[PDB]
Ligand binder design. Structure first.
Ligand code: HEM
Length: 383
């Protein structure tokens, strides 16, 4: 593409910009241009994207001098062998048993947020009143943050999602927490990771803090958007709100279709390490490769009528959580947050509606995780 063309902003909060669907060819990948003129491949085919995302030839090394920027981090910003070591230290903390202990806390939090919303009502900004606190507290419970420090932690987290004093405040708190936990172990991912490091066996104090900070950054804003834009999508599709009021398996199916349709992480970034033949093209070593989660999830070859939101469709292999080497580690926590927050919101406020026309909802730009900056809602009944 001769002039910078990626990214482009959404105009509809839960549809990709026209220019992205126009950029899609018959081919499963096309080409765009980043802000400084760098060419990049855009992967749009659902099947080819999955194939490429398990492929070791695509790097995520953010420390490489030529790593693409669209305009430093454990896990998400490294290749093997650092990647596999950090991730295998974490996997056992995201187990079924830890999730299920997190569930009733998210339940109790969601009820409280809803009582409070209703006490102040109507309406509310659903981002501020509801989507914003949930991922915060989920991360506190995940990490094992002393319950005494939750308000502080949420507050920091909220200030973050300029703002690089929030991020530094979290660093310094976490740095101290890590030290306190090493000398007096408690319960939580921090403790587990500390014990896992020590196993091996010198503790890397800054790496533990950075991993904790990556978990927070990766898991906070995207989940906030997935809650808020998920609610927006349902408000705009009131003929399907009932699916949320049926059994837990229907709730989980709504959650999967929202992940696919809304594609809150819209693209992820890679760099080729070697030549790759894909889809009639030859990606060369050093080439920027953007993987479009949005256009993959709207690929008609994978999903019949892909631009329709259908809460009952089979959405099993969506890439809303990515795929392969770096696919979302916190995905089962996020699913829990979404099921409990969306199911609780519509159970309590099934007539929840927008207080503003759709086209007045402010939404994030194209380089960002996708979703509303604010979400003015009102209701005139609640259960
Ligand atoms: C609905 C909410 C979420 C969405 C849509 C989402 C989406 C994604 C996507 C698309 C990736 C792939 C990144 C890549 O391939 O470059 C990813 C990775 C990651 N996510 Fe999530 N995520 C969510 C929530 C969370 C939560 C709650 C956590 C933490 C508890 C988390 C932690 C991570 C981590 C650590 C990675 C990197 C894993 C690795 O590099 O091996 N995410 N996420």
């Amino acid at each position: 593409s001769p002039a910078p063309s990626f990214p482009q902003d959404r105009t509809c909060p839960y549809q990709p910009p026209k220019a992205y669907e126009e950029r899609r060819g018959e081919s499963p990948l096309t080409q765009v241009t980043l802000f400084d003129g760098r060419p990049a491949w855009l992967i749009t085919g659902h099947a080819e994207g999955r194939a490429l995302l398990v492929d070791p030839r695509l790097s995520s090394d953010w420390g490489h001098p030529d790593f693409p920027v669209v305009v430093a981090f454990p896990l998400i910003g490294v290749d093997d062998p650092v990647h596999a070591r950090q991730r295998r230290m974490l996997i056992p903390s995201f187990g079924v048993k830890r999730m299920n202990a997190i569930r009733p806390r998210l339940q109790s939090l969601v009820d409280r947020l809803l009582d409070d919303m209703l006490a102040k009502g109507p309406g509310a900004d659903l981002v501020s009143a509801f989507a914003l606190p949930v991922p915060s507290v989920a991360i506190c419970e995940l990490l094992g943050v002393p319950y005494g420090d939750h308000d502080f932690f949420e507050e920091c987290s909220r200030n973050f999602v300029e703002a690089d004093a929030a991020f530094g405040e979290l660093y310094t708190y976490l740095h101290g927490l890590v030290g306190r936990k090493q000398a007096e172990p408690e319960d939580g991912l921090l403790d587990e990771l500390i014990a896992r490091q020590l196993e091996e066996g010198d503790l890397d104090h800054d790496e533990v803090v950075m991993i904790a900070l990556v978990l927070l950054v990766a898991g906070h804003e995207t989940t906030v958007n997935a809650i808020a834009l998920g609610a927006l999508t349902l408000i705009q599709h009131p003929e399907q709100i009932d699916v949320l009021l049926r059994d837990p398996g229907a709730v989980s199916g709504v959650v999967e279709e929202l992940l696919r349709f809304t594609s809150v992480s819209d693209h992820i970034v890679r760099m080729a390490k070697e030549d790759i033949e894909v889809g009639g093209a030859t990606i060369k070593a050093g080439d920027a490769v953007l993987v479009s989660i949005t256009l993959m999830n709207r690929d008609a070859k994978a999903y019949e009528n892909p631009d329709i939101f259908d809460a009952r469709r089979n959405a099993r292999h969506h890439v809303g959580f990515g795929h392969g080497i770096h696919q979302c580690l916190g995905q089962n926590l996020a699913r829990a947050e979404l099921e409990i927050a969306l199911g609780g919101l519509f159970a309590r406020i099934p007539g929840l509606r927008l207080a503003v026309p759709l086209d007045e909802v402010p939404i994030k730009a194209g380089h960002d995780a996708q979703g509303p900056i604010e979400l003015p809602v009102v209701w005139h009944h609640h259960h």
